[PDB]
Symmetry: C3
Subunit: 313 residues, 3 copies
């Protein structure tokens, strides 16, 4: 049995639309924990991370809420590192994707050999010197990369940070809205990725075969899955901050996660950018939440083909 540890993170200072704050909330009332237990899972919810307010948090150049983002992540990392040390998989129900910084950081403290699968319509690899918005939920990857150890200036609240992954340890799946500076970083650091073009060309089947062998070619190792809800198409996950048409299918979302589970190597999972306050209708919110939950359960065993426990039925 692969055991889980819920980590609610109602943070939103990584982007403008604050609705993401109460995202861990809408997921739990959906019955996520219950459904996980409803499965062969052993679940322990560590509660929502109370991120005290940091009123005095002016901009740093163009970067917004740097101390608030850096604090919420430095805290989360400490928690992530706690559950992983308690023999469990970290399930971070988030607000915005800036939390990844702390989530992957903590996971690494325990399993430094980890590999990352980043499902997003975006690469979130902009730097304070490349960002054009200042919103830190589109810059987390730039802080975790060792290669970028030089082009990222010191941001208030990110002193505690120390790049924990190489360019050859992360795979992107779903990309379809990448900046020019971001693309440049990809080709340069030789980052592995499967944009929607490659998904259309290859099929989600081969794309998963290739990403997993890429990550587990030489050796098996803890897998961290960072799932940004906007990776999927808006017709499935409409209630999110920055939607891009031409996204991953419901089925493709499930394939992604069913295959990861079958690897038996999932140790870290992030479920970010779900914002109910942006759904134009009550059903759009429900649609988004149900999809999020569904992708979650697939990571932990729920397969569309069927489930049966070892007992003579």
């Amino acid at each position: 049995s692969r055991t889980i540890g819920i980590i609610g993170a109602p943070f939103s200072k990584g982007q403008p639309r604050g609705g993401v704050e109460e995202g861990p909330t809408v997921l739990r009332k959906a019955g996520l924990l219950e459904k996980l237990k409803e499965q062969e899972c052993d679940v322990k919810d560590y509660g929502d991370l109370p991120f005290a307010d940091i009123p005095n948090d002016s901009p740093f150049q163009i970067v917004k809420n740097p101390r608030s983002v850096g604090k919420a992540s430095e805290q989360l990392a400490g928690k992530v590192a706690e559950v992983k040390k308690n023999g469990r998989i970290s399930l971070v129900l988030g607000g915005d994707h800036s939390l990844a910084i702390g989530s992957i950081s903590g996971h690494a403290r325990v399993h430094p050999d980890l590999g990352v699968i980043w499902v997003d319509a975006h690469t979130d690899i902009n730097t304070p010197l490349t960002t054009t918005s200042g919103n830190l939920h589109g810059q987390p990857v730039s802080f975790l990369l060792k290669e970028l150890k030089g082009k990222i200036p010191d941001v208030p609240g990110f002193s505690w940070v120390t790049p924990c992954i190489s360019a050859k340890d992360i795979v992107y799946i779903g990309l379809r809205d990448v900046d020019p500076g971001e693309h440049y970083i990809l080709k340069t650091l030789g980052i592995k990725y499967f944009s929607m073009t490659e998904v259309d060309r290859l099929g989600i089947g081969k794309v998963m075969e290739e990403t997993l062998s890429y990550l587990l070619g030489r050796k098996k190792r803890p897998i961290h899955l960072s799932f940004d809800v906007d990776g999927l198409d808006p017709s499935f996950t409409p209630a999110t901050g920055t939607p891009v048409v031409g996204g991953l299918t419901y089925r493709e979302g499930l394939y992604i996660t069913e295959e990861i589970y079958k690897t038996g190597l999932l140790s870290g999972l992030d479920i970010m950018e779900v914002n109910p306050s942006l759904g134009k209708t009550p059903e759009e919110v429900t649609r988004t939440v149900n999809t999020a939950v569904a992708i979650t359960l697939a990571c932990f065993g729920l397969a569309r083909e069927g489930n049966h426990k070892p007992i003579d039925y």
Copy 2:
């Protein structure tokens, strides 16, 4: 020319939502028969099967309307067996999927070597001892299997029944909502299937190549296609009793059926679970009916690439 024989079956006692009753009706007024004739088809409609009411039909353990379901099927089988003996393909326009019991039963009486392709989001293989709802439209396959000759008790109205197919003679396509007991039966009886996971992995192209070679590997034989409208995604066939998201695409539905036609071996076709009374809007009903009809015509020659009769145009 492969000739057809319409068999309307306005039955619904296989499940609670009775709207399925008047399903053969909404299909005919759509012009199905007409459109079939509008093709290279030779069509003969044997009329709707009048299933007299059986007021005194209390439950048998948990199983509901057992005598009503058993009667409607024992009758249909007698009809199916009639058209097939009259050199035609049986087209059963149904209500609920419990009718399959009689439809496949009758077809076998004529062609005992038949093979079955079961397109459904469900396996409908629960037994009276495993069913958790008691609705017989989710138990028909359990009654047709020879291997299960032992774990199915005697149900009032199903005495006439005698299992007519082995586990290696049926292929499922579309599965995405299977019970634990049902999954167990699959793995145990080694039943061939392509759930949505495999469809996503392989593609509907290879899935059809593999199911057909599986069924026709050793020898060619009469093919019975049991098509449950919920096999397709609810965005295409919304007006159905038990919808499951992440279903088969419109195109995939057509591919399935175009390939079956091209085999030249189609002898039995079921079109079930269409319930106009469940469509939330007039257009949802139309959408579902048009899709049903479309899948029907593809089984009998209508190809998206084009059609041309042997004449110098």
Copy 3:
């Protein structure tokens, strides 16, 4: 750099629903030209082709508005031939697909070795003697084919015409609504095509590999892409004259065009059948226009994976 030349063509006499007239208009106010320039493109808009009215244009047998269609095309050809001679790619923002006659005709005058990719739900290959509607937007291909040099009578306004392509120089992608006479012409002239059946079987990835090697097997040559908006599914391009469900996906539409751009051989592009007056809602119009624009930019470099100019970021 591959340079572009905008050619607005507000023509509609190729079909009944005149809304297509003001199609080049809705595309420009969308910012198409701007966005093209916003890219690495060198754009020059030759303005909209003013197609004077030809009041006295009675039917020719069954063919409607023959002099109006023939005139608007003979003019466009003269323009197309002009930009191509001015070292640019022809971008024809159209109304109805009958304009292809003149668009491909002019392009050929400059590059007679050109190859055509025809993205449509239809083949538009009916002849005045086969057409059953008389609308010339469903007959343009029949006028450009050298093999059909015999079965097409003289239509008022098409004297200037001289078939400029062989059956082995055109590839169709997207077909799903073909007449019997049209299918006959395909099989007979041995025309290469990938209907939705083949797309479902092979995947848009292989379909593009096969069409490009088919067209560029022996030698590289100028590529003309005739994109009829109805080639895509109505859920993406609803505001069009003759919509057919089961069409090409948004993603597939982009794959088509991204691969064509990567060939570096695009010389001619048509964007037809966009009719805002048929969108049932303001958003349906927007959805259709944005999709059209998006397919356009992909033809000229915009890739979902990312873009970066040769400069040390």
